[PDB]
Design a protein around this ligand. Structure first.
Ligand code: 5GP
Ligand code: 5GP
Ligand code: 5GP
Ligand code: 5GP
Lengths: 209, 214, 209, 214
């Protein structure tokens, strides 16, 4: 299942239908995915996750993108599914330093996946674009002979440039457009905006350096 | 603002993508407006209200069918905005059940003298909150009732508003969303006291609609 | 079980340990019960409630105090317990106009409890003081021959003036002091303050009219 | 501020009054600091941080034992405060794992050149967040490491801080709470990757402490 598909021809919402920080008001084009919708769509994701992974210890890894938020918001729901459990069950949390840097940067450095050998792994990225990053990330997590590997992602841009990666868990599948907000940033800006919006030709301009 | 518009042809979302109780998984056709979506719009709305009403003693009046939810929610956003004032300003909260029969006259017990506590409103600033306007009748009969008490200002806030031919054509001041002539349940809206626990707004199905009855 | 007892000799917290609207800063003496603690303590309450009342249709009534908040916050948790249910189960919500006004103001007016005859009832008040209100409220809800009646309350002041009412569900049992915040108000003020605090001789002064 | 103080003699709360997983209902002694309590304090703290740090590009640095929770939470309060600026200001978020052995020298791979991305910090305003300071060692070794990069300002924020004789006697800038020399778990703190799902902070019991092991 593809997640919630948003069409190419999607208009999104006027910036006025919600609360957008006034300081980003010329920088943003449209709200595409309002905060609460992400939340609910994420609640369910968690669920499809546990369906096939609850029951045994798992290792949730965060891609080091610098977008911890979604990872968090998802872990919180994965934790609330775990209480109902009858026996206690550990879970380990972590970031993967690196995502298309390779080899022996994995055999050791990324071999603290020596720690992954034999365990069930769940990788968490926020948006997937060309897929490169991720794919080069399974190659190596793979060398570790993990027992199993799933990949949840919040967004899956549909680009002619996909390099074929299709995660196991999708929240939303989007047009190929440039988004910020919620858990995506731009040069360290838009971290305080919690709806996924399209950025404007102007926004992308002034934010740089 | 027409609030967020939802054209007749909107197909919603399939049950599959959100969390829904399994016991109503047969009683619904599609997710119409998911909880969080509801939430974000309401936050906006609150700002919108205070644009107008803010800085004054506001009397928040609630129109009481089968629930409370929306109101309560909205009010948390308002309160939360009244936190920032350099001056403490009162708020008055009220509940009014009105579904008489028609009106068709009738006395003293519960009706005209429920205006006694209405003089409470007079030279006041009022905010009437409703959840969903259908025909719009209820609303229209309250303005009347209210407008007698000579209020300083009346403003109405709807979460949702249906497009229908069955409408007395009334339009709130603050609309959360304008929807198509569909029967929805969940979040704030009930059907015979069912769906109370469903958070998203959806369209019922015939089975559950026909299965939960009078 | 008495709920969470707070001692006579309780100091509470300095106003500075939390977020209090600056406009009530000379009006309040201490934070006694911070918002989140109420929340959790309420989460559990719900639970003890369902334990003995889940399973059949229930009628949750709110005392018309003019303090809807707690009632709401509790219903929301009672609703989230209901989803896990296998069969769908109705629940009806309402306020009781009146609470130590009597008689035939109950036989009809309060007889829309004719609607209560045969049903399982749950009454919700926010703070109980001398108990009068409530007690005169069971007398009449009783005339209706309800099938069963429980009474949850958020706060139970311990006063020499209790007139003996002891609710079935208690969140916190407090000294005899005058509180505001969360879901308690004073002449329509303090509705925007979400911690339960003690009011000061000054606060009670300027708020009146 | 010592944050909220919890004298050695605090007895906590019994399991009975809050929601706790049944599978840990034998592995804990008492609720020490319930989730919401945690929450309210953190909100305060955020205000406190922006008092000092606010209006500038802040680099938020996270000290990475076994979790993330507190940080994440804190940051929502900060972000939420940066919403109000008439000017958009960046934020930088970072994660630093440091638990070497001691230090005892060692090369190139992961250590000194993890300063390469530290020049990132230099003439910067820094905020180091930790969850619980015990001996205080970890903290002390970071200031050092950090202070080299010549930063414009370092400030540390702890959720909790234990009173112990085993302490290098370091004291954060922002303390959520100062506690007694007890072993706690839950909310943000884990014990061998257990208690991850417990929301309140509590004191372990011998059984679960002795039952979950290395
Ligand atoms: N802010 C933001 N980052 C994006 C967007 N699309 C892709 N990226 C960033 O560029 C990375 C490239 O991922 P890849 O192209 O390797 O699949 C993404 O992982 C993400 O970090 C976008 O719409 N906005
Ligand atoms: N569940 C639900 N109740 C509705 C709907 N339309 C109207 N009603 C109920 O009937 C009332 C209609 O009031 P009107 O505006 O028709 O006078 C609404 O406030 C609501 O309580 C709907 O589509 N769904
Ligand atoms: N604001 C506030 N109201 C209180 C307090 N104690 C009692 N009352 C109000 O006075 C009512 C009297 O309840 P009773 O005295 O009948 O038990 C309470 O139900 C509540 O509405 C208090 O500490 N603060
Ligand atoms: N669960 C838990 N971990 C602790 C406690 N005290 C210390 N630790 C862990 O060990 C670290 C101690 O760092 P120190 O300040 O001792 O250098 C803490 O950040 C924490 O991860 C405690 O009471 N409970």
């Amino acid at each position: 299942s593809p997640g919630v598909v948003i069409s190419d021809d999607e208009p999104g919402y006027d910036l006025d239908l919600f609360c957008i920080p006034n300081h980003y008001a010329e920088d943003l084009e449209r709200v595409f995915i309002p905060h609460g919708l992400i939340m609910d769509r994420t609640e369910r994701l968690a669920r499809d996750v546990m369906k096939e992974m609850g029951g045994h210890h798992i290792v949730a890894l965060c891609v080091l993108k610098g977008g911890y938020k979604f990872f968090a918001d998802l872990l919180d729901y994965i934790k609330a599914l775990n209480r109902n459990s009858d026996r206690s069950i550990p879970m380990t949390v972590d970031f993967i330093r690196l995502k298309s840097y390779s080899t022996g940067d994995i055999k050791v450095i990324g071999g603290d996946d020596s720690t992954l050998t034999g365990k069930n792994v769940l990788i968490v990225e926020d948006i997937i674009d060309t897929g490169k990053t991720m794919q080069t990330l399974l190659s190596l997590v793979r060398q570790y002979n993990p027992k199993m590997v799933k990949v949840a992602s919040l967004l899956v841009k549909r680009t002619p440039r996909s390099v074929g990666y299709k995660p196991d868990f999708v929240g939303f599948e989007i047009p190929d457009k440039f988004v910020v907000g919620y858990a995506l940033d731009y040069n360290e800006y838009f971290r305080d905006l919690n709806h996924v919006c399209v950025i404007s030709e102007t926004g992308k301009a002034k934010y740089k350096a």
